[PDB]
Amino acid sequence: MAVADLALIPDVDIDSDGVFKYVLIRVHSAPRSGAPAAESKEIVRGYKWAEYHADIYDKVSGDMQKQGCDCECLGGGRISHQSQDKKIHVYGYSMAYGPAQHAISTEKIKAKYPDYEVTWANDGY
Numbered sequence: 001m002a003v004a005d006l007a008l009i010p011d012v013d014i015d016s017d018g019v020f021k022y023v024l025i026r027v028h029s030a031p032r033s034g035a036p037a038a039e040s041k042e043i044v045r046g047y048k049w050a051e052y053h054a055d056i057y058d059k060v061s062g063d064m065q066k067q068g069c070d071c072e073c074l075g076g077g078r079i080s081h082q083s084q085d086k087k088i089h090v091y092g093y094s095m096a097y098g099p100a101q102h103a104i105s106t107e108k109i110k111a112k113y114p115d116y117e118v119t120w121a122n123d124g125y
Contacts, residue, residue: 001032002032003031003032003035003068004029004031004067004068004069005029005031005037006027006029006039006040006041006069008067009027009041009043009064009067009069010043011041011043011044011108011111011112012043012044012108012109012112012113013043013044013045014044014045014046014047014079014109015046015047015048015049016046016048016079016081016088017048017081017083018048018080018081018083019078019079019080020046020047020048020050020078020079020080021046021048021050021052021053021056021076021077021078021094022044022045022046022053022056022076022077022078022079022090022100022105023045023046023053023056023057023060023073023075023076023094023097023100024042024043024044024045024073024074024075024076024100024101024102024104024105025042025043025045025057025060025071025072025073025074026040026041026042026043026071026072026073026074027040027041027042027043027060027064027069027070027071028040028069028070028071028072029068029069030068030069030070031068031069032068033068035068042074042104042108043060043108044105044108044109045060046079047059052096053073053076053094053095053096053097054096056076057071057073057096073094073096073097074097074100074101075093075094075097075098075099075100075101076093076094076096076097076099076100077090077091077092077093077094077099077100077102077105077120078090078091078092086117087115087116087117087118087119088109088113088115088117088118089118089119089120089121090102090105090106090109090118090119090120090121091120091121091122091123091124092124092125093122093125099122102120102122103120105120106118106119106120
């Protein structure tokens with residue numbers, strides 16, 4: 001075993017080719033389940049294999065425990081890789097928890113990825 005740190009965890013990790021569900025998760029460090037660190041950050045996760053937002057959350061909480069971290073979903077929604085018109089967009093909510101703070105997610109995607117623009121809405125489900 002080795003310690004981990006929140007810098008090692010990718011800040012956004014999405015698989016995108018259409019509409020898919022996504023979740024915004026706060027992650028807390030707990031390196032080797034006992035190192036003197038308890039910092040936190042938010043991360044954006046979204047993969048089209050998930051039937052529901054809970055499947056993403058379950059995977060991610062599993063992986064973080066292998067790293068030396070723990071998780072709490074803040075909310076979620078959907079992302080759409082345009083494949084038709086202009087740019088990545090983010091919308092909807094998760095029935096499981098609530099709407100993500102999509103503004104955090106879009107700024108994170110915009111910082112991490114070289115795509116020119118990212119926007120969000122809360123227009124409907």
